[PDB]
Design an enzyme around this catalytic site. Structure first.
Site, short mmCIF file in Angstrom:
data_model
loop_
_atom_site.label_atom_id
_atom_site.label_comp_id
_atom_site.label_asym_id
_atom_site.label_seq_id
_atom_site.Cartn_x
_atom_site.Cartn_y
_atom_site.Cartn_z
N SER B 97 19.55 -14.36 -35.57
CA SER B 97 18.33 -15.34 -35.39
C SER B 97 18.99 -16.88 -35.65
CB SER B 97 17.57 -15.11 -36.65
OG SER B 97 16.70 -16.27 -36.83
N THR B 150 14.83 -19.19 -37.92
CA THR B 150 14.27 -19.57 -36.82
C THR B 150 13.29 -20.81 -37.50
OG1 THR B 150 13.87 -17.16 -35.94
CG2 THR B 150 12.64 -19.30 -34.96
#
Ligand SMILES: [Zn+2]
Ligand SMILES: [Zn+2]
Ligand SMILES: [Zn+2]
Ligand SMILES: [Zn+2]
EC number: 3.1.3.1
Lengths: 444, 444
Positions: B97, B150
């Protein structure tokens, strides 16, 4: 639109990994044409989902590289390919080659194993039959046996994909059995269909004799000849052909079964990425130089078919990407994808030069292969490979405990170029492709 | 460029499965605009590859159905997301991520675990920092901890994604540790970044005290208040907010860790599709009504942010699609995809009405989940589900023998709508997205 989608420079630097050189807006607006297509080339990578495209690119061209054929089609989308359950008529989330091939060539969903017939076993005309009826030239090429579902779907209407020749049909598709008053086996219906150019493997089924009709007693090969077909069995003779039409249809049988795969590599194994060294694919030594490559067949078919003034419809299939995926063989699978890219370059070069050609590259369904981390400890079959980047890429096959890895139901990429290519953008269904082609050619 | 992509009628009949009602050419040509975007909403479905989208659609809407939000974006393409190996600088085919979020928000590839820094550990400005500098309003929402990769990638520059607060940063990111003269932990940099709207979970890291600086000794939560942040901890208070800007930034902490998943279902098991009955997902009873859904947070953020005249940049993340994928939990994973679809509908409804908004929906990377045949005997974790079609869909997780299923490297879908959306079509890279947004906003 853009022809070069490779990383711009140093992938470790800001902007170095970009594939875009500018703004696509104008370029894209310019490639949007609703003028009719004169020709259509539909390339199918069997079992070539996004994962298969990525693995082969990573290997053959590198992470930041790009397939000059496969990755160069400007208009992209994702499409669904679910089949139907024959009893219930409810969706069957994972289709086989037959039900999906039937969908794009017919515009109707069907059950797994069916060729050219809906779930009621009713026949529906294929796009090839419609093109031939309108006067267009028709081609059908594949690296698999010609009796395989994908090439067979354009010319045969059988209830079970296993009805290759007279003998299989009598026992498995009796309602189609020629003796039973049916249209005949896949091979017999292929011979009847009489497409201008048909190239592939599957010569062994041609050694069967028809059980009834005008050519009864005569092998299917003999019947082809008696019917006016030019038969070629290698690169040399194929090449020698100067014309193919309704008076002189071409039929190339380059192998008894499926044509040999281009690359050799070992089969993935349990903990292979851990216990076994990284592999580097090599050329398949069992593959003869006399055996045509898919690009060669594609190129020759385009040449012969382009002589027709009304236009042509051609379908090309790189079949073994799927077969090697089932076999858990990364090298064989990647080679077959590189092979197909070449055939795609041939089609694109023709299309860009001709200007009225719609080129479509997609797959019939998704497959098993996954790209996982080098250190992954997976329950299935794995293998480490040395890519063009000089890095190791590990691939995994973990959806079957049997000897054959299974198809998957994920939607996948469909890409196009040329007149009517916009109909491939966004989410669409495999059945839409049929209508897209039928309308591009105005084959109503 | 259509809005309804559902099957036309009876999927068992000719044309009944089609999703297209006509020719997209004109419609598509009309949705192509290179005029500047005033706003941008980037929705990220964590680990939401094409397979995940298909499984959730098949379940929630049926094979022939369509996500009113996710599947309604007209311009589509596939993008790559390989990370880099920190030592070699060569590609690392499967990103995490952190490395991917850094790529779209910064435009530079990096190693797995890095936030806001390239492989040399050098800081690069994020698209949020650039929007804030130009006077635009900025929003950052997620269903996960805000310290999570994120959302953190937009506001923090850390060498390890594990540097959540003061304590972890001291031991794992000493060069960033506030005491060591660094910019601080992820949470401290988030507090400094001062985005207008920040909503998510991860309240627990806010219970840590700064080790140095002006707010040393004071918890991070106290610091937020001392700095003028409005803290809301449930739906009622969120809703009560009337404004959020640089003088009154909003900070929603709806959970200690990640916000609860919406659906409950059992974990997939070895031969689960064979030894266990088909499951039907239900709503998660542990999830409190006081906890906002993603669409609610997205909606409120759009409202507060749209009051800024220059425009805004908003990032929304449906994080648990991934987490449940790792957990081999179909229901939790599908619910989190349905959850995100709703947030996407909110974004689209606003964009269609406002007209200068670019909406993008994509994922950071591919994941484990595969849709396999009902009868599949897989080596991994499987489960049968009852879909909206009243048919059984089987899902397989077979790339890890550990307790966590792994990410995969396959290229995946990227969809967009609005001015500059054409830059998403064809093959692109995750780093191109950064350039697409920067240019749409004219954030040079
Ligand atoms: Zn297939
Ligand atoms: Zn297959
Ligand atoms: Zn992720
Ligand atoms: Zn993950």
């Amino acid at each position: 639109v853009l022809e070069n989608r490779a990383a711009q420079g140093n992938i470790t630097a800001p902007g170095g990994a970009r594939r875009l050189t500018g703004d696509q807006t104008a370029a894209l607006r310019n490639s949007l044409s609703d003028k009719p297509a004169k020709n259509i080339i539909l390339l199918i990578g069997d079992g070539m989902g996004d994962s298969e495209i990525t693995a082969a690119r990573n290997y053959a061209e590198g992470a930041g590289g790009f397939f000059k054929g496969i990755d160069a089609l400007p208009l992209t989308g994702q499409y669904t390919h679910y089949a139907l359950n024959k009893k219930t008529g409810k969706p069957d989330y994972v289709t086989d080659s037959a039900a999906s091939a039937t969908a794009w060539s017919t515009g109707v969903k069907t059950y797994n194993g069916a060729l050219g017939v809906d779930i009621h076993e009713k026949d529906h005309p294929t796009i090839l039959e419609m093109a031939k009826a309108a006067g267009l030239a028709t081609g059908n090429v594949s690296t698999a046996e010609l009796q395989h579902a994908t090439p067979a779907a354009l010319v045969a209407h059988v209830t079970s994909r296993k009805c290759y020749g007279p003998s299989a049909t009598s026992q498995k598709c009796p309602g189609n059995a020629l003796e039973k008053g049916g249209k005949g086996s896949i091979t017999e219906q292929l011979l009847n269909a009489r497409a201008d150019v048909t190239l592939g493997g599957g010569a062994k089924t041609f050694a069967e004799t028809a059980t009834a009709g005008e050519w009864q007693g005569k092998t299917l090969r003999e019947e082809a000849e008696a019917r006016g077909y030019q038969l070629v069995s290698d690169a040399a003779s194929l090449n020698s052909v100067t014309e193919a039409n309704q008076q002189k249809p071409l039929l190339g049988l380059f192998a008894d079964g499926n044509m040999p795969v281009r690359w050799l590599g070992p089969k993935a194994t349990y903990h292979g990425n851990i216990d076994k060294p990284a592999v580097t694919c090599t050329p398949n030594p069992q593959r003869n130089d006399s055996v045509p490559t898919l690009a060669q067949m594609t190129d020759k078919a385009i040449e012969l078919l382009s002589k027709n003034e009304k236009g042509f419809f051609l379908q090309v299939e790189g079949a073994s990407i799927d077969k090697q995926n089932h076999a858990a063989n990364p090298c064989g699978q990647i080679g077959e994808t590189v092979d197909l890219d070449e055939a795609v370059q041939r089609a694109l070069e023709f299309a860009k030069k001709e200007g009225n050609t719609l080129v479509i590259v997609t797959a019939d369904h998704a497959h098993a292969s996954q790209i996982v981390a080098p250190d992954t400890k997976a329950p299935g079959l794995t293998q480490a490979l040395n890519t063009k980047d000089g890095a190791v890429m590990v691939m995994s096959y973990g959806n079957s405990e049997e000897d054959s890895q299974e198809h998957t139901g994920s939607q996948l990429r469909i890409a196009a170029y040329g007149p009517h290519a916009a109909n491939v953008v966004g989410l669409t269904d495999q059945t839409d492709l049929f209508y897209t082609m039928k309308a591009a050619l105005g084959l109503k």
